[PDB]
């Protein structure tokens, strides 16, 4: 009778995430930023501010930071925007695992929307 989360669809609507990180790193990696292809989270550091928020995951597209639209950002300017966003960082994110999966070898999306790497 357990109720497993792993079969519930991951929400695909945009979300607001507010991370308070003072003057430390946010604790995640981004990929993308080839010509408007999107900026995606590829890795969240265990114990970092992004992990502690509990509200971001690999495969999230970063739509904006502090009101600055990053949908069509280059990866380096995205990184600059994130690193210079200040102590309070307001991210709009949207889970886009299909688009993310193009970047990571042998990765695909299962029926709940989770990214699987074989």
């Amino acid at each position: 009778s357990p109720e497993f989360l792993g079969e519930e669809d991951i929400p695909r609507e945009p979300r607001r995430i507010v991370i308070h990180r003072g003057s430390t790193g946010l604790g995640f990696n981004i990929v993308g930023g080839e010509d408007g292809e999107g900026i995606f989270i590829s890795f969240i550091l265990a114990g970092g501010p992004a992990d502690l928020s509990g509200e971001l995951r690999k495969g999230d597209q970063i739509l904006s930071v502090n009101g600055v639209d990053l949908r069509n950002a280059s990866h380096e300017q995205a990184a600059i925007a994130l690193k210079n966003a200040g102590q309070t960082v307001t991210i709009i994110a949207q889970y886009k695992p299909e688009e993310y999966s193009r970047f990571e070898a042998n990765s695909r999306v299962d029926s709940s929307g989770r990214i699987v790497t074989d």
Partner: peptide, 8 residues
């Protein structure tokens, strides 16, 4: 692909 990856 112009691929790059940054830590933030």
């Amino acid at each position: 692909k112009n691929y790059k990856q940054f830590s933030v």
